[PDB]
A paper describes a structure:
Here, we report the crystal structure of a ternary sub­complex of the MSC, [name]–AIMP2GST–EPRSGST (the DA2E subcomplex). The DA2E crystals belonged to space group P61 and contained two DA2E subcomplexes in the asymmetric unit, each comprising two molecules of [name], AIMP2GST and EPRSGST. The [name] structure in the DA2E complex did not exhibit noticeable structural changes compared with that of [name] alone, in that the anticodon-binding domain (residues 57–146) and the catalytic domain (residues 189–497) of [name] could be well modeled. Extra spherical electron densities observed at the [name] dimeric interfaces were coordinated by two His204/Glu208 pairs, each from one monomer, and were modeled as Zn2+ ions according to the metal-content analysis results using ICP-MS. AIMP2GST and EPRSGST both adopt a [name] fold consisting of an N-terminal Trx fold and a C-terminal α-helical sub­domain. Interestingly, Ser156 of AIMP2GST seems to play a crucial role in mediating the interaction between [name] and AIMP2GST. The side chain of Ser156 acts as a hydrogen-bond donor coupled with the backbone amide group of Phe339 of [name], while the backbone amide group of Ser156 forms a hydrogen bond to the backbone O atom of Phe339 of [name] [Fig. 2(b)]. All three AIMP2GST mutants could not form binary complexes with [name], which suggests that the hydrogen bond from the side chain of [name] Ser156 is crucial for the interaction with [name] and that Ser156 phosphorylation would disintegrate the MSC assembly.
Residue numbers in the entry:
A (entry chain C), E (entry chain D): 117 to 170, 180 to 288, 292 to 320
B (entry chain A): 23 to 154, 179 to 225, 247 to 273, 281 to 495
C (entry chain E), F (entry chain F): 3 to 159
D (entry chain B): 23 to 154, 179 to 224, 247 to 273, 282 to 495
């Protein structure tokens, strides 16, 4: 992009913790000029969210806005505006370039879809089912991908932290494993 | 005729009586005030009559209610006759009863109720026809649009002052005639005279001679000229926040005739530096030089590009090329081809053209020679800064132009109360 | 050694169109069952329609259905979600279709002047939508979408 | 020299740095902020120096503090030398320590403390001289008097608006050159359903120009509805200045002694007949229909001050003959009008009346005054369609400021007087 | 007076009830254009006092003002300004013209002085002594003058209503006798 | 018929001056005792100095010491209170005397171009005041008061 700036329009009623974690991760790779703004649409955005971050390579402009789906506008003269905090999360993480085979990459993308739709906006029924698939997966591998940390882990953890079911043993170890990492704790503290 | 007392052309109001009478505003005629005997002084907007009944639209400052003169227990036939015979725009004192309507009156602002008339006196008799050239403008300013535009424009001026005054500013009175020029000189003299923060609402002048109203700011800062720029920005933000909170009635009244999406802005006002803007225009396919000034069409485009990305009708363009700005513009200490200047745009049209002023007499004189000015005729201005001149910046906005671009109107004349053809 | 079982009761139109474009690259078979399952290995299966589409486009290297960079790669992910939600429902369709029209104003294909999963997943869901077919008959369908839909109907049939 | 870092002529502020620095205002340097390391940007009012020590009077907007550059644990000899060598009115950034004084500093506003200097940088070097031209007026407006007068005048304008706006008024912008008077435009606004209007802008009456705050208000049945409003607005201005701007009043009082401005809450109203009785009792041969001569206005004010003890009163029901044509005649006594003047310290500030909203009567009175109807056709035509009953009045911002502080010449309250 | 107006400057900290009673009495004799004002000196005058009165012959302009002694300015071009609520009370009552002999007139004036100085600003000692002289006097005569109601009665009653000591029998009958009159009750109710 | 007993320890100066001006009108005698008492009848006595002054001026009809109307009558009542309080004390005397000066600016006598109780009661108290006699010696006494005091000292011997 000639704009060189990642614009992200997000609704403050449902803060995209998935993107705030990935932002901290992005800054640990590149020189990021991060800025927070409040759109005319929303009034009286919570204090914590306004200063949630506290030349350069990339711009990261987070605009708190009254939108139905979290939107990213990057290099509009070459790229259609991206909708869905899941789709934006994949893009941000993919900037580090941890290339995976076809089976893993698809399974990682599958894990994002689960977290965003089924787990987040689901009954105690579906939540319980998601925990089993995670518990079984985390029983075999250290992460949900197992090679190393992936977007799948970031987004899913972020969704779990932003919602009354019994939590299994492997998920508890994976939760502290995530929370132990610098980008996860920094982002979560500035939300709480 | 038994209602002969209840109507007529009442004697010219030369302040004869102080009646125990409460003339309730039309906006206050809601469902809450139903089945009450109220007095109303309004104009007759339109008066349709058929046989036994006469309906009037009683209007008052962009608000109107449906009034009804029915023959029966209240009025006579000659009263209904007189009611329809009242010429258009005549002002009338009306003693009526607010009665709840079975279905909404979509035409009127007071949809919840109608006014069952008991008395009607013409206090001011309008002559029959209506013109379509001073008396022209008088009628034109009664239109719900004009009323809403200029009541909102009054709002801008109030929000402008209340904002600056609360942040510790002092209003000055620039003379504006000298034996007619621009007011910047006087603001800068005030800065040089220990008046830290000054503003002036007054008429400004630009193959024609043009007069318009300008709201001007001049502020002494500590170390960076952004201290002023970020203040001017917040002040324009506070104006927008103010209009969208209080003047929502007036915005919609203009919207109804001139459709326009709500004005959009960011709380920390968006700032693009000149280099960033050129990259956006060149990516958008515009052959432009590094030191060239933004052509009026490019300003229009750049605004659209900003709206496309950030979705804000209000942004700041900073670090302009020094060559294109006036002499008194402080050069950038690092890149001496760039300046510490800025423009602010509403819907992609320039409203403000501010910068840091040169408070050093010598550098101010050098830049005056660079622009080829006879120092003799600006000796007085330069001499002002020789004794304790603090660092300061400023910027001015066209009240009419701001009102126009906020409501998204086309021609400036729409937001000028008394335009001179 | 690839096998796909499809819900015969409601065929995944976009998946089949994808399968037809990867026949050249990797050997894949079509069975008919009660639900959509892509059998890759004894351990590797996918239930979600988008998961199936994503795998096929990735494994079909020469096809290039997942774009030519991370930017086009992401654009496609957007359109998969777009098709799966906003087109899958006919709620406020008048708005949805006008967004897709705007996006196709200066685009021939949805992503990168070549056939992508975006083109397939959207066209498939759009064909399967009722309100779309009504807009076409009543001739109130936007210009750019109609021309794009007509162009894909030609290449896909 | 070891303090060469701590002083000097710092580079011209071209917005190079954004320093983590808090330049505290001089007024905030009180006993509460004692034994604190503070930064101050002020001007050098006067700098007296004797051997080892150099004392400065650091001034900022009609406030000043005593600063001290002492050789020892803090400063060097060349720094004290440089401190006294700083030319008058030069602006300086000062890093000092607020220390409590053993005895009050009666000369300064900050009597409770002095500033023990640690650094002094001249950010703006004033040239040595001070003139006594344009640059003349720049220095003159730094005088604690001027500062106080014009900061208070800004107050009047704010209190004028805040008052009227809260009462449901709408500010208009009269076109100042086409160059004549603004009443016409206010009346057209009234005739255009703008019930309550005011305009702060330059007015004219050799050509003289001054700033006028004008009111025009449509009333129900009596013109007193407007008069009693205009009065309350002037009362609210006075109440406002005496509450908030007490610092600015005393600063002008210190140079120009004047008793506090006195007024009554329901503003005193005398009718013209009552005023003649007071003047005749005071021994003044005057006619029933004559206009109050400027000296009689001065006297009558003193007589009102003697009786009621108010510097602000209203003279009502003026003789019709002496007022302009557009003045509505009294319905009972057609020799009298529905006009009024308002006086501050016995000098006229306001000259208002009820306007003639009937086109015919307005034309009759225009012929009585011998006006060519042709050249005022436009004005008369404004009232032909739904003209409501209305009155108004205007005040001279400079004149109000002058008579409130009890100053002699108007030039004192005019910021940029034109010789 | 060519002014035709009785101006009375009074302190709202100590409302002169004596003058408010006499005002009601004055209106019952003459056509009085009564008006209440608040001087710049005093701020936030109690609500009741502002509207304490709910061509013409006399003006009665009551100005609430920060003065030490209640002052009356009447026909300044012929009469020195009068100081003392006692002295003003004598003048107001004397407008009705109930002429008395030298002995009574002096005894009436003596009764005013007692009320204003000794009774108002006095200890429980002097108050008790005043009651005896009143009790003894009211024992012989219906009022303090005894012939008819006098300024002496108005001022003294007013002082007693605006201050502990045992009250005798005659004073209680004289108090209700006063309170029963129209001008006394009307004035006292609007003070509260 | 009339008798006055005076405090010999502190004579009521103004009362005596009044008594000297009513000798022509009504027969009055002077005894010397321990307090000020005007014995009019067996039932009628007056302790207060002002009460005594008031009675004498009222009963002495031809003297006319209580003015020529209710207005002058009231002016005198003011000056009796003025003398009894503001002059009787030397507290803020600098203010008190300047008020009396202003009042005597265009007046020859205090009330109605003739000798009144005002003239006597004020002059008496003013003579008896310490700070007054100090102002005269130091020549800081106001103009109009001095001229008035000098004129009464001449008439009163
Ligand atoms: Zn304001």
């Amino acid at each position: 992009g000639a704009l060189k700036d990642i614009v992200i329009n997000a609704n403050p009623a449902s803060p995209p913790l998935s993107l705030l974690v990935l932002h901290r991760l992005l800054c640990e790779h590149f020189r990021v000029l991060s800025t927070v703004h409040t759109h005319s649409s929303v009034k009286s955005v919570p204090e914590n969210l306004l200063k949630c971050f506290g030349d350069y390579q990339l711009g990261f402009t987070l605009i708190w806005k009254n939108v139905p789906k979290t939107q990213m506008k990057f290099s509009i003269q070459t790229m259609c505006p991206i909708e869905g905090e899941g789709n934006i999360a994949r893009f941000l993480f993919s900037l580090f370039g941890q290339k995976h085979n076809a089976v893993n990459a698809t399974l990682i993308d599958s894990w994002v879809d689960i977290a965003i739709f089924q787990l987040k906006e689901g009954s105690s029924k579906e939540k319980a089912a998601v925990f089993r698939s995670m518990n079984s997966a985390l029983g075999k591998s250290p992460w949900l991908a197992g090679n190393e940390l992936t977007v799948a882990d970031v987004v899913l953890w972020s969704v779990l932290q932003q919602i009354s079911v019994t939590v299994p043993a492997n998920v508890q170890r994976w939760m502290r494993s995530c929370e132990n990492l610098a980008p996860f704790n920094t982002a979560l503290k500035l939300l709480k | 005729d038994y209602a002969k007392e209840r109507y007529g052309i009442s004697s010219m109001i030369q302040s004869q009586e102080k009646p125990d009478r409460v003339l309730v505003r039309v906006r206050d005629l809601t469902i809450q005030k139903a089945d009450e005997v109220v007095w109303v002084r309004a104009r007759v907007h339109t008066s349709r009559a058929k046989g036994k009944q006469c309906f009037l639209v009683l209007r008052q400052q962009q608000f109107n209610v449906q009034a009804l003169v029915a023959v029966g227990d209240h009025a006579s036939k000659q009263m209904v006759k007189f009611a329809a015979n009242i010429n258009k725009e005549s002002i009338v004192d009306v003693e009526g009863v607010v009665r709840k309507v079975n279905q909404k009156i979509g035409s009127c602002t007071q949809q919840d109720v109608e006014l069952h008339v008991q008395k009607i006196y013409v206090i001011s008799l309008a002559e029959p026809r209506l013109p379509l050239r001073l008396d022209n403008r008088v009628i034109d300013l009664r239109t719900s649009t004009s009323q809403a535009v200029f009541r909102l424009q009054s709002g801008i001026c109030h929000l402008f002052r209340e904002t600056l005054i609360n942040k510790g500013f002092v209003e000055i009175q620039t003379p504006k005639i000298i034996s007619a020029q621009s007011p910047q000189l006087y603001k800068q003299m005030c800065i040089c005279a220990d008046f830290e923060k000054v503003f002036s609402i007054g008429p400004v002048f630009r193959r024609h001679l043009t007069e318009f109203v300008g709201l001007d700011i001049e502020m002494a800062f500590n170390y960076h000229y952004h201290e002023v720029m970020e203040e001017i920005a917040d002040t324009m933000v506070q104006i927008f926040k103010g209009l969208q909170e209080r003047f929502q009635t007036e915005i919609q009244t203009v919207n109804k005739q001139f459709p326009c999406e709500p004005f959009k802005f960011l709380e920390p006002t968006l700032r693009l530096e000149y280099c960033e803007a050129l990259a956006m225009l060149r990516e958008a396919g515009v052959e432009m030089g590094d030191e060239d000034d933004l052509s009026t069409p490019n300003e229009k485009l750049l605004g659209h590009l900003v709206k496309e990305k950030y979705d804000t009708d209000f942004y700041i363009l900073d670090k302009y090329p020094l060559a294109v700005r006036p002499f008194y513009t402080m050069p950038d200490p690092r890149n001496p081809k760039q300046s510490n200047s800025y423009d602010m745009f509403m819907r992609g049209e320039e409203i403000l053209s501010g910068a840091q002023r040169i408070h050093d007499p010598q550098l101010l004189t050098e830049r005056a020679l660079h622009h080829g000015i006879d120092l003799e005729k600006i000796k007085a201005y330069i001499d002002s800064f020789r004794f304790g001149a603090p660092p300061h910046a400023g910027g001015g906005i066209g009240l009419e132009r701001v009102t126009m671009l906020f409501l998204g109107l086309h021609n400036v004349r729409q937001t000028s109360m008394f335009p001179r053809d | 050694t690839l096998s796909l079982t499809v819900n015969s009761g409601d065929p995944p139109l976009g998946a089949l169109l994808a399968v037809e474009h990867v026949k050249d690259d990797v050997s894949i078979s079509v069975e008919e069952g009660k639900e959509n399952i892509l059998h890759v290995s004894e351990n590797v299966i996918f239930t979600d329609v988008n998961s199936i589409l994503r795998y096929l486009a990735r494994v079909a290297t020469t096809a290039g259905l997942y774009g030519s960079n991370l930017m086009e790669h992401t654009e496609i992910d957007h359109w998969l979600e777009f098709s799966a939600t906003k087109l899958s429902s006919c709620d406020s369709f008048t708005s949805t279709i006008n967004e897709l029209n705007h996006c196709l104003s200066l685009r021939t294909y949805l992503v990168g002047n070549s056939l992508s999963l975006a083109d397939l997943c959207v066209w498939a869901t759009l064909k399967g939508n009722a309100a779309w077919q009504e807009q076409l008959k009543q001739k109130k369908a936007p210009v750019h979408v109609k021309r794009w839909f007509g162009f894909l109907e030609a290449q896909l049939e």
